[PDB]
Design a protein around this motif. Sequence first.
Motif, PDB file in Angstrom:
ATOM      1  N   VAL B 188       0.725  -1.073   0.031  1.00  0.00           N
ATOM      2  CA  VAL B 188       0.066   0.072  -0.009  1.00  0.00           C
ATOM      3  C   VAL B 188       0.828   1.149   0.039  1.00  0.00           C
ATOM      4  O   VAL B 188       0.638   2.088  -0.530  1.00  0.00           O
ATOM      5  CB  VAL B 188      -0.893   0.054   1.291  1.00  0.00           C
ATOM      6  CG1 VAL B 188      -1.502   1.480   1.285  1.00  0.00           C
ATOM      7  CG2 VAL B 188      -1.950  -1.076   1.025  1.00  0.00           C
ATOM      8  N   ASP B 194       0.286   9.737  -4.652  1.00  0.00           N
ATOM      9  CA  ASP B 194       0.229  11.262  -3.918  1.00  0.00           C
ATOM     10  C   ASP B 194       1.585  11.375  -3.935  1.00  0.00           C
ATOM     11  O   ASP B 194       1.963  12.486  -3.386  1.00  0.00           O
ATOM     12  CB  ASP B 194      -0.388  11.224  -2.689  1.00  0.00           C
ATOM     13  CG  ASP B 194       0.104  12.338  -1.728  1.00  0.00           C
ATOM     14  OD1 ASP B 194       1.138  11.924  -1.323  1.00  0.00           O
ATOM     15  OD2 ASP B 194      -0.506  13.189  -1.940  1.00  0.00           O
ATOM     16  N   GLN B 208      -3.892   0.891  -5.676  1.00  0.00           N
ATOM     17  CA  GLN B 208      -3.856   0.892  -4.023  1.00  0.00           C
ATOM     18  C   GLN B 208      -5.271   0.708  -3.486  1.00  0.00           C
ATOM     19  O   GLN B 208      -5.287   0.041  -2.657  1.00  0.00           O
ATOM     20  CB  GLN B 208      -3.133   2.429  -3.896  1.00  0.00           C
ATOM     21  CG  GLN B 208      -2.950   2.286  -2.276  1.00  0.00           C
ATOM     22  CD  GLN B 208      -2.657   3.730  -1.764  1.00  0.00           C
ATOM     23  OE1 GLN B 208      -1.673   3.980  -1.156  1.00  0.00           O
ATOM     24  NE2 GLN B 208      -3.550   4.737  -2.132  1.00  0.00           N
ATOM     25  N   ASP B 209      -6.205   1.154  -4.333  1.00  0.00           N
ATOM     26  CA  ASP B 209      -7.488   0.691  -3.624  1.00  0.00           C
ATOM     27  C   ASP B 209      -7.882  -0.467  -3.658  1.00  0.00           C
ATOM     28  O   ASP B 209      -8.376  -0.926  -2.502  1.00  0.00           O
ATOM     29  CB  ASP B 209      -8.709   1.200  -4.680  1.00  0.00           C
ATOM     30  CG  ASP B 209      -9.175   2.561  -4.370  1.00  0.00           C
ATOM     31  OD1 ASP B 209      -8.547   3.662  -4.064  1.00  0.00           O
ATOM     32  OD2 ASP B 209     -10.458   2.527  -4.032  1.00  0.00           O
ATOM     33  N   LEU B 212      -5.814  -1.831  -0.590  1.00  0.00           N
ATOM     34  CA  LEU B 212      -6.369  -1.317   0.729  1.00  0.00           C
ATOM     35  C   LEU B 212      -7.518  -2.026   1.099  1.00  0.00           C
ATOM     36  O   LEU B 212      -7.792  -2.522   2.217  1.00  0.00           O
ATOM     37  CB  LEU B 212      -6.659   0.273   0.568  1.00  0.00           C
ATOM     38  CG  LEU B 212      -5.800   1.042   0.640  1.00  0.00           C
ATOM     39  CD1 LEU B 212      -6.452   2.639   0.086  1.00  0.00           C
ATOM     40  CD2 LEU B 212      -5.321   1.539   1.940  1.00  0.00           C
ATOM     41  N   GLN B 213      -8.321  -2.613   0.145  1.00  0.00           N
ATOM     42  CA  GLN B 213      -9.249  -3.624   0.156  1.00  0.00           C
ATOM     43  C   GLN B 213      -8.729  -4.799   0.708  1.00  0.00           C
ATOM     44  O   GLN B 213      -9.352  -5.683   1.884  1.00  0.00           O
ATOM     45  CB  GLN B 213      -9.773  -3.840  -0.956  1.00  0.00           C
ATOM     46  CG  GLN B 213     -11.372  -3.188  -1.347  1.00  0.00           C
ATOM     47  CD  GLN B 213     -11.990  -3.447  -2.451  1.00  0.00           C
ATOM     48  OE1 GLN B 213     -11.518  -3.394  -3.678  1.00  0.00           O
ATOM     49  NE2 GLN B 213     -13.054  -4.376  -2.155  1.00  0.00           N
ATOM     50  N   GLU B 216      -7.503  -4.367   4.419  1.00  0.00           N
ATOM     51  CA  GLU B 216      -8.703  -4.162   5.370  1.00  0.00           C
ATOM     52  C   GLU B 216      -9.194  -5.650   5.878  1.00  0.00           C
ATOM     53  O   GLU B 216      -9.671  -5.954   6.947  1.00  0.00           O
ATOM     54  CB  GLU B 216      -9.860  -3.343   4.582  1.00  0.00           C
ATOM     55  CG  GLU B 216     -11.131  -3.275   5.589  1.00  0.00           C
ATOM     56  CD  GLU B 216     -11.960  -1.920   4.965  1.00  0.00           C
ATOM     57  OE1 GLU B 216     -12.269  -1.799   3.615  1.00  0.00           O
ATOM     58  OE2 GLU B 216     -12.626  -1.457   5.929  1.00  0.00           O
ATOM     59  N   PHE B 230      -6.987  -1.042  11.090  1.00  0.00           N
ATOM     60  CA  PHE B 230      -6.941  -0.712   9.926  1.00  0.00           C
ATOM     61  C   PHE B 230      -6.550   0.984   9.666  1.00  0.00           C
ATOM     62  O   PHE B 230      -5.577   1.319   9.209  1.00  0.00           O
ATOM     63  CB  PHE B 230      -8.304  -1.107   8.906  1.00  0.00           C
ATOM     64  CG  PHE B 230      -8.215  -0.632   7.555  1.00  0.00           C
ATOM     65  CD1 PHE B 230      -7.113  -0.878   6.685  1.00  0.00           C
ATOM     66  CD2 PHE B 230      -9.161   0.324   7.091  1.00  0.00           C
ATOM     67  CE1 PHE B 230      -6.811  -0.542   5.332  1.00  0.00           C
ATOM     68  CE2 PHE B 230      -9.083   0.619   5.701  1.00  0.00           C
ATOM     69  CZ  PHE B 230      -8.073   0.001   4.777  1.00  0.00           C
ATOM     70  N   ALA B 231      -7.376   1.888  10.521  1.00  0.00           N
ATOM     71  CA  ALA B 231      -7.534   3.116  10.500  1.00  0.00           C
ATOM     72  C   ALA B 231      -6.143   3.578  11.274  1.00  0.00           C
ATOM     73  O   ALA B 231      -5.202   4.610  10.926  1.00  0.00           O
ATOM     74  CB  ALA B 231      -8.641   3.619  11.061  1.00  0.00           C
ATOM     75  N   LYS B 232      -5.779   2.838  12.361  1.00  0.00           N
ATOM     76  CA  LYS B 232      -4.713   3.145  13.182  1.00  0.00           C
ATOM     77  C   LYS B 232      -3.400   2.769  12.468  1.00  0.00           C
ATOM     78  O   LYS B 232      -2.502   3.717  12.456  1.00  0.00           O
ATOM     79  CB  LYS B 232      -4.709   2.367  14.630  1.00  0.00           C
ATOM     80  CG  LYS B 232      -5.884   2.810  15.612  1.00  0.00           C
ATOM     81  CD  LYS B 232      -5.893   1.779  16.765  1.00  0.00           C
ATOM     82  CE  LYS B 232      -6.983   2.038  17.620  1.00  0.00           C
ATOM     83  NZ  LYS B 232      -7.505   0.972  18.534  1.00  0.00           N
ATOM     84  N   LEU B 234      -2.977   2.986   9.097  1.00  0.00           N
ATOM     85  CA  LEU B 234      -2.960   3.995   8.371  1.00  0.00           C
ATOM     86  C   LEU B 234      -2.335   5.305   8.594  1.00  0.00           C
ATOM     87  O   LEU B 234      -1.645   5.952   8.170  1.00  0.00           O
ATOM     88  CB  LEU B 234      -4.383   4.650   7.576  1.00  0.00           C
ATOM     89  CG  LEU B 234      -4.803   3.179   6.584  1.00  0.00           C
ATOM     90  CD1 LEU B 234      -6.242   3.668   6.133  1.00  0.00           C
ATOM     91  CD2 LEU B 234      -3.847   2.892   5.423  1.00  0.00           C
ATOM     92  N   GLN B 235      -2.834   5.749   9.863  1.00  0.00           N
ATOM     93  CA  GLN B 235      -2.552   7.018  10.642  1.00  0.00           C
ATOM     94  C   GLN B 235      -0.928   6.770  10.791  1.00  0.00           C
ATOM     95  O   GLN B 235      -0.128   7.909  11.003  1.00  0.00           O
ATOM     96  CB  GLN B 235      -3.245   7.024  11.901  1.00  0.00           C
ATOM     97  CG  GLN B 235      -4.706   7.045  12.021  1.00  0.00           C
ATOM     98  CD  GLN B 235      -5.301   7.966  13.130  1.00  0.00           C
ATOM     99  OE1 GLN B 235      -5.231   9.371  13.163  1.00  0.00           O
ATOM    100  NE2 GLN B 235      -5.897   7.088  13.875  1.00  0.00           N
ATOM    101  N   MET B 237       1.026   6.053   8.956  1.00  0.00           N
ATOM    102  CA  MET B 237       2.121   6.429   7.637  1.00  0.00           C
ATOM    103  C   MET B 237       2.513   8.068   7.871  1.00  0.00           C
ATOM    104  O   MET B 237       3.366   8.357   7.150  1.00  0.00           O
ATOM    105  CB  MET B 237       0.990   6.305   6.369  1.00  0.00           C
ATOM    106  CG  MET B 237       0.773   4.885   5.945  1.00  0.00           C
ATOM    107  SD  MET B 237      -0.154   4.701   4.443  1.00  0.00           S
ATOM    108  CE  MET B 237      -1.902   5.200   5.077  1.00  0.00           C
ATOM    109  N   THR B 238       1.853   8.562   8.833  1.00  0.00           N
ATOM    110  CA  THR B 238       2.226   9.995   8.916  1.00  0.00           C
ATOM    111  C   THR B 238       3.413  10.099   9.823  1.00  0.00           C
ATOM    112  O   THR B 238       4.231  10.749   9.595  1.00  0.00           O
ATOM    113  CB  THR B 238       0.960  10.968   9.455  1.00  0.00           C
ATOM    114  OG1 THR B 238       1.467  11.063  10.962  1.00  0.00           O
ATOM    115  CG2 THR B 238      -0.123  10.248   9.365  1.00  0.00           C
TER     116      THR B 238
END
Lengths: 260, 274
Positions: B188, B194, B208-209, B212-213, B216, B230-232, B234-235, B237-238
């Motif tokens: 991913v 971007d 990528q979509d 990501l699927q 998930e 999943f969300a944690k 991705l976060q 990545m920052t």
Amino acid sequence: ESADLRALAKHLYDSYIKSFPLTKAKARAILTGKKSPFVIYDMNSLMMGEDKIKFKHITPLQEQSKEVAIRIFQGCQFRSVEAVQEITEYAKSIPGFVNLDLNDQVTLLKYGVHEIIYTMLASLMNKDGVLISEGQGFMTREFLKSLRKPFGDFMEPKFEFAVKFNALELDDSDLAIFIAVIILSGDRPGLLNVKPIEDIQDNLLQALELQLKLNHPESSQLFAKLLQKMTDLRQIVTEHVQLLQVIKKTETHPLLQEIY
Amino acid sequence: QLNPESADLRALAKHLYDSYIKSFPLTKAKARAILTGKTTDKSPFVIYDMNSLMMGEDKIKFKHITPLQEQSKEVAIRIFQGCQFRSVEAVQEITEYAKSIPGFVNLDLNDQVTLLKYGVHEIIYTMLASLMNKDGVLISEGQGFMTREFLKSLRKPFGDFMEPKFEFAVKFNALELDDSDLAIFIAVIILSGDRPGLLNVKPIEDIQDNLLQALELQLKLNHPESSQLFAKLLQKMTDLRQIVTEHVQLLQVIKKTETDMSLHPLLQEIYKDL
Ligand SMILES: *C(/C=C\C/C=C\C/C=C\CCCC(=O)O)=C\C(=O)CCCCC
Ligand SMILES: *C(/C=C\C/C=C\C/C=C\CCCC(=O)O)=C\C(=O)CCCCC
Ligand SMILES: COc1ccc2[nH]cc(CC(=O)O)c2c1
């Protein structure tokens, strides 16, 4: 549980509507042209904008700099501070937030407002300009980019972000939950009790996910894409602080400087 | 339950994990086995100071993991040149992995280079966490273990290079991802879209979509009770972005302070106009 998630989403939307004067729905109507706003596209435009419609900002105060670039930069500050209060009111409406350690509530707001400010500023921008003073005016992207010294590039980064962010086509109901997710970031420095914060954000994320799936069935992985934008936000913020730093190399009231 | 849709996502996850095991010699599973000091055959030699380092060259023989400079007359420099060589090797591994990502080699040649250019270090830091615990990091394919404190006391410029990595690792590892999870997460990262200068963003985002699927579903099946993993994830990545930026700034300082130390061409090309 799905019912509880929709209740939360609705609650956040209602609060978001009450706390923020200019919504994205309203801003978009004005931007697409669907009482035209006063357009500031150059120096003469600006001067007339201040005069014909005294922009409720810094423009009124004397002993400033009477130098457009500097006055525009400072007006951005005045509005940011105003936005901070709207954000703060909204935060207190987020279930559980007020019950958090008071120092942590301050820490979350301290490190969250800039990310939120730029997120919401995107709602008022298009590739050509940005809505100002409650949408009464439209300041040209070109005009801003034509400012001298380091002022010509302070807004451009926000525009680039906005263009991409806006491609996700989020509406106010989506944004209301996203904004709350940003506020409840358990990785802010100095937090004393991270657990409660992550527990609330986890519930907010669940609500955001359901919201995006019901509201944008066609946008696969919109949830994932929106979260990825967090990277863009924090980058624009740190980048902002750096320019803000370099600004202390121009020397652009005491009580005023205190306030802002 | 199971359907043609989720079935395809599982097949992709299997493919990526399979390819991951083939491309990366030291997996997280093997790293944790060595670190948890369970066995007696996987014991690493620990380098916690100068003398230990001196003897490490004997035990955990380094097949020139540090550029052939003989007695480079400087621990900080040797350690540094050492991490440089490892990074280059890691770039090679990640590059091999990337080619296995369905659709990656079919993209415009220039975008392929762009995606690797910006994704490589983010992946290196992600995977480096697999080799770390709050007290140190495995080196020389797991034969050695260099303590966090030793690295932290190197010298003004170098003493600060790894700390940020460790800080990241301790938190990232708290997510308890396993190799099957990371194989997809790394895929991913690579297919961002971007990234600065991309010619054709569309095909990349489509790939990528789908990844990501895949990610998930993987996280939900592999970590049933870990809400919003999943969300944690991705976060995080920052956090990687931050690390990279900060690392680049450190390199600029080193470039000016140590005009007698060479920096690998591959790495230099990657950091150029980044
Ligand atoms: C100034 C910086 C931030 C604006 C603060 C919050 C964004 C959300 C709503 C306010 C936007 C409307 C407005 O700009 O007044 C950005 C600028 O565009 C500087 C112009 C000075 C403000 C008139
Ligand atoms: C270098 C310090 C840290 C390691 C640098 C980058 C990590 C790259 C790859 C890790 C593999 C991750 C995986 O695939 O699972 C330390 C040294 O090597 C120098 C010491 C040499 C002794 C002189
Ligand atoms: C400490 O010496 C270095 C020098 C150049 C580097 N490029 C990439 C890395 C990986 C990492 O940051 O571990 C690295 C390490």
